Amino acid sequence: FVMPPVEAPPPSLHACHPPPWLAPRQAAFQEQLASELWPRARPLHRIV
Amino acid sequence: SGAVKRQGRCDTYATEFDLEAEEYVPLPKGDVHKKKEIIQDVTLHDLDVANARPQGGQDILSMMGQLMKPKKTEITDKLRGEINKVVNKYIDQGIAELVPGVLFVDEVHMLDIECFTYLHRALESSIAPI
Amino acid sequence: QRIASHSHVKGLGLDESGLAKQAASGLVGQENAREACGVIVELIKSKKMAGRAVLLAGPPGTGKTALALAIAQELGSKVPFCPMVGSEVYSTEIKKTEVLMENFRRAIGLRIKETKEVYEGEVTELTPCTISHVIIGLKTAKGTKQLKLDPSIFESLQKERVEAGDVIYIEANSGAVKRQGRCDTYATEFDLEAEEYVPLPKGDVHKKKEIIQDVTLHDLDVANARPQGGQDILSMMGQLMKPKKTEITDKLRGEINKVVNKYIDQGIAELVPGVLFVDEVHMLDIECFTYLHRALESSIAPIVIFASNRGNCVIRGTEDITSPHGIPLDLLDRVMIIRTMLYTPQEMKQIIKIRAQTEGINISEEALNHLGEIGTKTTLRYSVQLLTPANLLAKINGKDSIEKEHVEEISELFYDAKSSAKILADQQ
Amino acid sequence: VTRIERIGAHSHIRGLGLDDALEPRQASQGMVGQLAARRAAGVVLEMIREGKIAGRAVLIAGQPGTGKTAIAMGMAQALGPDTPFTAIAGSEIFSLEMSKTEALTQAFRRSIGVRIKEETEIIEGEVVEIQIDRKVGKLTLKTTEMETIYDLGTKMIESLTKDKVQAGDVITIDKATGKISKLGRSFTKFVQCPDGELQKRKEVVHTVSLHEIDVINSRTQGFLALFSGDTGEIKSEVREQINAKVAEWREEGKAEIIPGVLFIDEVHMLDIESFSFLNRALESDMAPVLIMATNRGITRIRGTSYQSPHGIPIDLLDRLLIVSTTPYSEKDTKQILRIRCEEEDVEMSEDAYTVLTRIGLETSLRYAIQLITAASLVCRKRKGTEVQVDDIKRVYSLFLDESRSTQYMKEYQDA
Amino acid sequence: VTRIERIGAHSHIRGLGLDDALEPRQASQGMVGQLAARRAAGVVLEMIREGKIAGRAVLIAGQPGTGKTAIAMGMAQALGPDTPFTAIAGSEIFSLEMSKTEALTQAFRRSIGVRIKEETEIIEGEVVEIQIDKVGKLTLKTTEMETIYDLGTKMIESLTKDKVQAGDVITIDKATGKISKLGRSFTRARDYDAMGSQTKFVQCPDGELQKRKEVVHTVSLHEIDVINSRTQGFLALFSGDTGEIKSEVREQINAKVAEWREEGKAEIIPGVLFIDEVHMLDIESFSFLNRALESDMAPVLIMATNRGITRIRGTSYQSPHGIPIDLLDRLLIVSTTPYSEKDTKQILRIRCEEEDVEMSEDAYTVLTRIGLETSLRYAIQLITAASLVCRKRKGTEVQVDDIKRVYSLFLDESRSTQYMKEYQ
Amino acid sequence: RIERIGAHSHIRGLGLDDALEPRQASQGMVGQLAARRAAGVVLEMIREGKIAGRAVLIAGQPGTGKTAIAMGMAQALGPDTPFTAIAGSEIFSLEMSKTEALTQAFRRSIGVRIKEETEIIEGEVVEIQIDRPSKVGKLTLKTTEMETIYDLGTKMIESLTKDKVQAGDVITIDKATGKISKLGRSFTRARDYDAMGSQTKFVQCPDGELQKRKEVVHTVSLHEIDVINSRTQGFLALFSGDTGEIKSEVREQINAKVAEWREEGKAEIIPGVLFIDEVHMLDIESFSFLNRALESDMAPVLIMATNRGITRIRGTSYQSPHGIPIDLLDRLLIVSTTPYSEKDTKQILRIRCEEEDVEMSEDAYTVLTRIGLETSLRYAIQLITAASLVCRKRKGTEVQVDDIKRVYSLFLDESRSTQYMKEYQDA
Amino acid sequence: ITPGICFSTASLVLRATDVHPLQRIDMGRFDLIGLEGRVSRYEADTFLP
Ligand SMILES: Nc1ncnc2c1ncn2[C@@H]1O[C@H](COP(=O)(O)OP(=O)(O)O)[C@@H](O)[C@H]1O
Ligand SMILES: Nc1ncnc2c1ncn2[C@@H]1O[C@H](COP(=O)(O)OP(=O)(O)O)[C@@H](O)[C@H]1O
Ligand SMILES: Nc1ncnc2c1ncn2[C@@H]1O[C@H](COP(=O)(O)OP(=O)(O)O)[C@@H](O)[C@H]1O
Ligand SMILES: Nc1ncnc2c1ncn2[C@@H]1O[C@H](COP(=O)(O)OP(=O)(O)O)[C@@H](O)[C@H]1O
Questions:
Q1: Closest chain D residue to G16 measured between Cα atoms?
Q2: Do chains C and F touch (3 or more CB pairs under 8 A)?
Q3: What does the record give as EC number (chain C)?
Q4: Which of B45, C391, D69, D229 could form a disulfide with C361 if both were Cys (CB 3.0 to 4.6 A apart)?
Q5: Which residues 6-25 on chain G approach chain B with CB closer than 8 angstroms?
Q6: Atom of ligand 2 at shortest distance to CA of D69?
Q7: d(CA A41, nearest CA chain G) in Å
């Protein structure tokens, strides 16, 4: 039944004028990670 | 928060099947779209540990809580600085209200010399409580 | 440019015959010690002797670290130099033995001439020919060129989402396609759009140029320590850290040495021995010494310089064994010891004048004389400190130079070590 | 009403009360007396603002409670923002996730700022309409002086579909990245629309320290400094090349470094291994001019039975400048108490001031400063307006002090 | 030209100067003197190369600079590179991720070699065509012959996940452990300007498509790290294993190695574990060794300590060589007598022969006398020091005067300590 | 079944009456009337559970029954009341601090039993129909009194197919969740009777109404609650090694929610006992924490067995009685155990030998009591089984005096080995 | 759910510090870990030569 008294968004975002190749590669990295582990993390949804 | 719960199937369909594993809850009342104000009371350490150990829904960053989940060490710029700034932004606009506390450190006589020496800068801080 | 404590020291200052002068390079006095330093500096340039050590012994403030920095400077930049403090060995993340091991593999440099080539320009068209190959047209200010682009890297091409209009890099060696952004002439196509719009390259699309940059052997070891890729969950390598994790002697460094020797035999690589420097060796543990006095006996260990800033004292880790210079007699042997002695009033005055004319402060004679005389009462490292605030006060008073009324008045605002000890004898 | 920061122990300190020639006033900017040490603080502050001769250490010695930390806080306040003033206690380096030497060099890097200039263009207006044709569309922004349409490109349409921003929202759009930010729903959170031009070039400057750069250039999204997840960066591989690249930024017109300030309080907690590292970390170009203080005299050095001033070895003691603070007199103590009362809302009587000054000269200075608020509140208990001598006496009876509490130990407790 | 390994301390020790009858020569293979000690070294090397008994510990002790580490490196060189020889310092086991006992078990298992041999039927040939409809066919080619192969779902999935293409010189075996070995050459310039990092053009294979490959490799018994986790063996390239699970390690690795020894697919070849400066071990590691040497498979131990009656780390007790007596009981101590006026000059001449530092007879005599007065190792540095000092002097042979010139620059431990009368 | 007997398996509880009057040798407890009465008082205080935060210490000579009294209390307490036995040296862990280990130990002896009234069905499956194409089916359950037919739904059909039950099986259907728990098979067999299959076993069908309201109960310890609530790692409270609970975000919330549950009546309380054996191992910091850890309503009573006298406290150089500082020793009251007399040691040996199923002659008892009075009691108890083996090896019936005297010369207790330690083995 | 997401900021000059294609050496000619699961012992010992 416990819950964190506060829940902030996951990323500690960083404002910048970054290079154009960083954000797309990070998005592809997140896409790769999500499509694989979430189907296997489904059983923990009940407790989450 | 984005969290969607499953209270159960509608109550009117209880007569549909003979016996089912679904739970039946009465048709929720009130308007489909409703708001409400909640007067929550929390501490600053909660925000500190929430920004140091983030959480969320449907984000793979939760992996941090499985392989990289030791006790955190919020840096000075995070424990102080930005958290205090956002709390002041909440306060000065009429949404938050500060309430000091009382830190009762019993059996202090057995702390380490390092703890005693850090208490110097700890108490002299303008944020430290009574 | 951030004048440092040893910025004025630019070399040992020996003559063509190897004798020590009072050279303008930044060192005065210490004739015998500077001669020994210049004699050992030839060992480094010889590139034939490995597994050596030199102990700079002497009272504090006598300039042993200055001699080490002069040795480092005289060599130049081609050979690496890795200054390390003895206290740094005590890492709470990884054992000290492997820390010292890696430290020993960092001095050894490695020069290699890579005649690589990359292709840059606005990508004009992609025509993927089960892909047999993909032709890519790159446009630059000097013309356009079409390249058959190894369909195996079409994966990366798609990973970058690059298409006609973008400016990109590509490395001929591995296919390191890098999207710089959209072309300049395509800007404003949408009056509001989050893009970079990098200028069009002006040089020849075919960019073949040699890179003679050097890398360290420890860098190679680290690059070969952990794997790469996110096959299934190995993506975890872009996350929780990799602090100086321990390598293994039996299967990593041996193969590294084998492959490096192979490449050197082919005439591609070029080895350049470095110089390691350990400050305050007395801080190391007795086990660090027991490992060091046997690891430096190998055939690959680079020449090291030991600096002990104290005399006969108990070695750390035993609390009951005294040895000269805080180094055990077992390890104190095999190490050429160079003594560093105290200076004279004249030498202290010369050092102070050098520091002055290096920092950029002009000082009168009567002022410099007493500033150096203070170097006799106090340590040499106190007049150097007093010199600056004197000029600061002078400039505050309009006077651009340092008169005797400033150096003798600023010595009152600050106290030296001995005066503080005298006053602090009350335990508070 | 009450902010996260309240009346602490060093609030009255607003900076060094020096003249144009670094001459301390009798009492100014909340700093009483302490002429010699305060002017020495001024000299070090001036040579810091200069930022040419780096790698200098100073030690503020003196009896316990002789404004050793007040001088540091005043120096910090005078230096003002835009210049890193790192303050840490000698016990903070003892960390389990990183070695003491690594924590020390980390604090050093944190005490060095890098000034970089940006020439980004930021939009600021209000949304009139957003369109989506499943994809391309158009965007109409409004300000109090003009309105304009915008062609919603791939990035813009995607970002505005992901975000819930809609018509009637004062927003900002960084054309470089496209970060959308809404400062309030509408006219009256709600907030009015912006004024002036809709799109205007804005210069941005970031005083990022070498620590931030290293943490940014260490891992994939390596900006984990917020919780110090890192246990130590790779020395000489990712830490020396950053220095070379910063030097490249310099002497070219790209960036300029800003010498910060480090203040290690209670340095006697640092062990011999930490002092050994300072003997060489203060000899590099990128080294800040640090200050330190210690109330102990010739005490034992943590690590061995050696006795040395400040508990610091001689090798480092002969490497720094000592700044001793003299004990305060009746005048200085009374003026400090008066400034402390002015900082708060308390207003004591003249006889009350004399009694408190005598009480603070008898046992110690800090005891009187602490009794100030106690007597102020006890006065409000009897429904008074001014803190009279009777209230201070009642407090002195209620609350004990170090010297009087130690003497009351005529009954044996645990041990 | 300059290799990674230039001349070090123990570089002139290129073997053990013993005859066929293990009779020590006065000067042979770089070693000098130490007749009884080198004969004992050869005796222990004989049982090393034999590899029948396990749990043999030979301790070499003597004054500092008598050749303990020298004899150790001589044995290491006399012993062929095939048998493992794990040389570690007494301080290498004090790890933070491993305990003072598990690191020692890993060091022990690292000195036991295992010559594995494997045989697998390999189908290799240049891919000419790959059709897919799921079912398909494969047209492999060689410079000698060609043939079609019918595939299936399991093979099609492996040909798709691994993006094989017409021309890729594929390598397949039973169980389909396919490898994208190399690419055709007839598809000239598949990459005009930019090529992949893993791509490389290779000539067409020869012979038949089906060829039997035999692979032999010597892996240490510490290969447990290969199965101590789910990693692909790369844990052996960094810290990795820390626990050394006794059940797994023993009851799987030992049993399966014994099974391989019967099938003939492997064979143990015990090595040596030389712990230099072993006096730094605590009573815990010594009491552990006391039992570890009693195991079925355990390499022989070689120790080089110069400690007399000294304290044992982790205790207030004192024992010979600074280690407990219960361990000395399970050792075999060897002597290393100090050198004389003749042996010192001989080893100095040998060391000069290494770096071709041609010295004069008077210089040799003076250096031998200096080394007999102060120390042996010190005289070894003056060789190169005087060589470098004379090189700048525009000379070709170190003289006595050049030796004395260096004798004043680099003072010895003795004279250095004698000069510490100032006490800063 | 097979769990070999231990040194403390003979005591089945304190041999007390209804008035806490200890009997001489009842229920395995021999002699030691005062300490047994004290333990009975503290146990009667335990089964009441209206005050929490007290402690009681049992001190005495080595081998007088401290741990014996602890085990007797544990046994007389029975289940349904958490009892945690820990040695002082167990809290010195590497994955958590000492205070954290102490908090976990305390909260491991605080149980929360949530009474859940879930209605279910229980009957013998007679027939099942399921139309695969959504899929639909039916179910028929039989009990000794009545039968009925059910029109299964899609999810009920899915659950029954996952369980894949068949006719004749006796199952329980959770009306809420639909979980099918099969207790066994009724008198039915032979799916085909021509295919292979294991041996058949049958059990009686359920009785009474088909659908009946029964009472389930879920009893977990506060430590298990804080654990599974510590982090989102799935199926915690076993996880083989790891507890890193946070003080406020979890612990205080667990306490508050347990108080709220007690308020409305979901699970009120069931305090336990934390027997900390050999508490002299705890560090000064452990006692410092215990000082204020007992000052909480959720602090269960603890029992400590001490063998030390006037000895320095571990972690410091402060001499104090029982090796415990007078700060923590101020709360706990101490109980004294009297050394067993001749008739007490004799009867203890008699009971301990009757527990191991060994017969010893009347003179065997006398000689063994002689040995256990000149020597320690534990050695005389250990000599009961050792002497019981030579007798069997000689095909004997009951242990004689000669067998005991031979096994006494075969071994050495504590003094015949130190007296012979005159060879200077090693030091 | 605090909307006050911590929002760091810095110039892009701090991110482009490690990108210089025509000034970096190819480390692919020295890596050994990548060859453990791609290249075979036989491929390197018998076929390639
Ligand atoms: N021969 C010299 N010439 C010029 N300056 C010197 C010389 N010797 C010492 N110094 C100065 O004295 C200081 C001694 O510092 P350091 O080398 O750290 O002391 P030590 O090495 O004796 O511990 C240096 O900052 C250096 O500028
Ligand atoms: N120059 C000054 N002006 C105003 N207040 C001062 C001055 N010097 C000291 N004080 C006061 O006296 C107290 C001395 O304590 P502090 O300086 O913090 O002790 P320490 O420096 O030993 O930690 C401070 O709380 C401060 O408010
Ligand atoms: N018999 C020998 N032949 C050649 N060189 C020797 C001989 N004995 C000793 N040395 C030299 O003397 C040095 C002694 O070093 P080391 O073996 O570490 O001393 P010890 O083993 O006595 O502690 C070696 O570097 C070696 O080159
Ligand atoms: N009251 C008792 N009744 C029966 N046996 C006892 C009793 N007290 C002690 N014993 C016997 O003493 C042996 C060890 O006692 P122990 O619990 O270790 O005492 P202590 O806790 O004082 O060391 C046990 O094997 C047990 O059989």
A1: D217
A2: no
A3: 3.6.4.12
A4: C391
A5: 6
A6: 21
A7: 23
Helix (H) or strand (E) holding F390: helix F377-393
Cα distance between residue G23 and residue G31, in whole Å: 19
Pocket test for ligand 3, best of E25, E278, E302, E376 (most atoms within 8 A of CB): E376
Resolution (A): 3.2
**Among the CATH numbers 3.40.50.1400, 1.10.8.60, 3.40.50.720, 1.10.510.10, which is that of D329-415?**
1.10.8.60
CATH, range C343-426: 1.10.8.60
Query: CB of F209 within 8 A of CB of F146?
Result: yes
Given the candidates 2.60.40.1930, 1.10.8.60, 3.30.2000.10, 3.40.50.300, the CATH classification of the domain at E340-424 is 1.10.8.60
Residue C2: other Cβ atoms inside 10 A: 17
Q: Which CATH architecture has domain F341-427?
A: Orthogonal Bundle (1.10)
C neighbour chains, 3+ CB pairs within 8 Å? A, B, D, E, G
**Tokens found for residue D210:** 């070498």
Residue nearest to atom 7 of ligand 1 (CA): C63
Using CA atoms, how far apart are residues C264 and C113, in angstroms rounded to an integer? 12
The answer to whether the annotation marks C64 as part of a ligand binding site is yes
Q: Tell me the nearest-neighbour CA distance from C11 into chain E, angstroms.
A: 18
Closest CA to C76 of C33, C41, C113, C112: C41
- Chain G CB contacts of B86 under 8 Å are 2, 4, 6
Long-range contacts of D94-97, Cβ-Cβ distance < 8 Å, separation of 24 or more: D94/B114, D94/D269, D95/B73, D95/C92, D96/C92, D97/B73, D97/D228, D97/D231
Chain F touched by E245 (CB under 8 Å): no
Cα gap D237→D105, rounded to integer Å:
15
- Whether residue C222 lies within 8 A of chain G, CB to CB, comes out as no
CATH node for E8-112+220-339: 3.40.50.300
**DSSP string covering E126-156:** EEEEE------EEEEE-SS-EEEEE--HHHH
Architecture in CATH of C1-106+224-342? 3-Layer(aba) Sandwich (3.40)
Taking CA atoms, F409 is separated from C297, F375, F378, in Å, by 59, 14, 17
- CATH homologous superfamily, domain D8-112+209-328: P-loop containing nucleotide triphosphate hydrolases (3.40.50.300)
CB atoms B75 and D226 under 8 Å? yes
**Nearby residues of F319 by Cβ (< 8 Å), 6 or more positions away:** F310, F311, F312, F313
Interface of C with E in 278-297 (CB under 8 A): 286-288, 290-291, 294-297
* Top-tier CATH class for F6-110+221-340: alpha beta
Give the method used: cryo-EM
Nearest one of C409, C61, C381 to D57, comparing CA atoms: C381
First to last CA, chain E: 46
Q: Which residue has the tokens 């800090």?
A: D366
